[PDB]
């Protein structure tokens, strides 16, 4: 099961899965569903991306997400060799959610197109939420005439998602992976509490993740060619930042671009070849990990077990192990 701030996540346990061959298939058994008590999803719909033929096109389409709102229990996952080209967003009150093994790629919808998105609202806030095993890409590509948003946010929450572990995912070919916060202004996000481990984030540009108040465990994740930064704490949040591989990276562990800084505890890290820093521009405060010093103790006990992977055999294990079509390996 899930380790971390989500590990009492159990979806829709061990309930008869309900096929599903389509996102409105999908959507249709969630709309269904009397919101607690257990719903299993096997998404088999097999998409071919080979149909996108042009990067570009997608952004000015209409966001295809499906919707879990206001309902709990629930599981989502993937058959092997199943792929969406559809989204999925978690929202208000609804709690105890499990996704995994899904392929989610090349989505429609540009600043909408949702990949994983977990969403408090004036009904409630999701908690006990596992993302796990997911394979999540787009395209590094800035679309002409699309402002910075040709594609949207990877494995996202917002306004106050609590105790969440999203694990041995794969995010690549992805500018903005993870959003932890949505603005400086989402106080609501204090409560987080969010365990990041045994990820693969490769060829992408930033947010990996974004955290905006709000307490974090960030472990066991392998960076490889991330070119603007890294995990950016902000607005006070503090992560504990252990035993995670790091190569070509630029601002690899930052606090950058909120009106108030945010801190890390540092202990472990694997740190290779090809770190890069940079200042950012404006005048808001910053901080660069440039030399691997915590600049806060994690004020609490995580109030949960967790075994390491040895750093140096982070980027290793995390190949052998992270996101769909894996047999959910660890």
Known sequence: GPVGYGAATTGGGN???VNVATFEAMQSAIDSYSGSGGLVLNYTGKFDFGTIKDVCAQWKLPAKTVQIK??????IKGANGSAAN????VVGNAHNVIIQNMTIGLLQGGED???ISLEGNSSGEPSKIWVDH???????????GAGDASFDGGIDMKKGVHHVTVSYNYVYNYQKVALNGYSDSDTKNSA???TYHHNRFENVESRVPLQRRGLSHIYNNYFNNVTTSGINVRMGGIAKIESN???????????????????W?????????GITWGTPDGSKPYANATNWISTKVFPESLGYIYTVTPAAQVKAKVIATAGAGKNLAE
């Open 265 to 273: 505890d540092l202990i472990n890290n694997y740190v290779g070849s």
């Open 134 to 144: 997911n394979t999540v890409f787009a395209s590094l590509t800035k679309c002409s």
């Open 70 to 75: 206001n309902k709990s229990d629930v599981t």
């Open 113 to 115: 197109a949702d990949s």
């Open 86 to 89: 559809f989204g999925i967003r």
């Open 192 to 194: 987080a509490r969010t």
């Open 245 to 263: 591989y790091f190569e070509n990276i630029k601002n690899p562990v930052t606090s950058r671009d909120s009106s108030e800084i945010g801190y």
């Open 15 to 17: 309930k008869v899965p």
